[PDB]
């Protein structure tokens, strides 16, 4: 029935405007309320605002109300979120959603919004950092561990395989941590028999699409 689909950029610079779009379908867009919800990398879910499909009127989060503008477009059956003067704090996954409400009986008042359908959400990162490829450094010493250090790159993500993907057993690629410099950094390790060391070859394949850089690094003793 109802199907949502968020759209928008991946990168926004601080102080600029964040614009994401949501396409609804499989229902009368004018007969329901639609809005935006977001979740920050570690912080919880945060409702931004919801509006009526017909009038475009609605309600915003008081904490974001001054910077928020949720518009509608009946043609595309589409709503848009214009968040002005963003900072790193506005880095989040942005979901589109339908806002149902109920009579808070017996009064002629209404409940607030609960959400029966969400979109997959679009990720958006706010940063002034420039595009930069990672530096790859090897991590070396019956069982033995080894890996690669992929650091000082922007933006997310980097991909890391071992022996062109032919080595996956015991592999662990850690989530990227945002260093104080605005650049990201992670490590990828893999457990291997210490007996095969010195003979077996281990190469981590680091690929950073948003900056072309494709690096193969052989991890030795």
């Amino acid at each position: 029935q109802v199907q949502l689909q968020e759209s928008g950029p991946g990168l926004v610079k601080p102080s600029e405007t964040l614009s994401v779009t949501c396409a609804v379908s499989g229902v009368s867009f004018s007969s329901f309320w639609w809005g935006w919800i977001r979740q920050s990398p570690g912080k919880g879910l945060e409702w931004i605002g919801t509006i009526y499909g017909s009038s475009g009127r609605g309600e915003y989060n008081p904490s974001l109300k001054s910077r928020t503008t949720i518009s509608r477009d009946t043609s595309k059956s589409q709503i848009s979120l214009e968040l002005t003067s963003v900072t790193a704090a506005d880095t989040a996954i942005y979901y589109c959603s339908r806002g149902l409400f109920q009579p808070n009986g017996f009064s002629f008042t209404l409940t607030s919004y609960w959400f029966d359908v969400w979109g997959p959400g679009v990720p958006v990162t706010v940063s002034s950092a420039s595009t930069k490829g990672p530096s790859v450094f090897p991590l070396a010493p019956s069982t033995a561990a080894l890996g690669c250090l992929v650091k000082d790159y922007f933006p997310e993500p980097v991909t890391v395989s071992w022996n062109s993907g032919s080595l996956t057993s015991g592999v662990h690629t850690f989530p990227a941590v945002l260093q104080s410099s605005g650049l990201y950094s992670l490590s990828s390790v893999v457990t291997v028999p210490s007996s095969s060391l010195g003979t077996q070859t281990y190469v981590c394949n680091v690929n950073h699409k948003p900056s072309n850089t494709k690096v193969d690094k052989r991890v030795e003793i």
Partner: peptide, 11 residues
């Protein structure tokens, strides 16, 4: 008008 829209939606 907001509350008015709200109730119009439900009917």
């Amino acid at each position: 008008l907001l509350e008015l829209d709200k109730w119009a939606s439900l009917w």
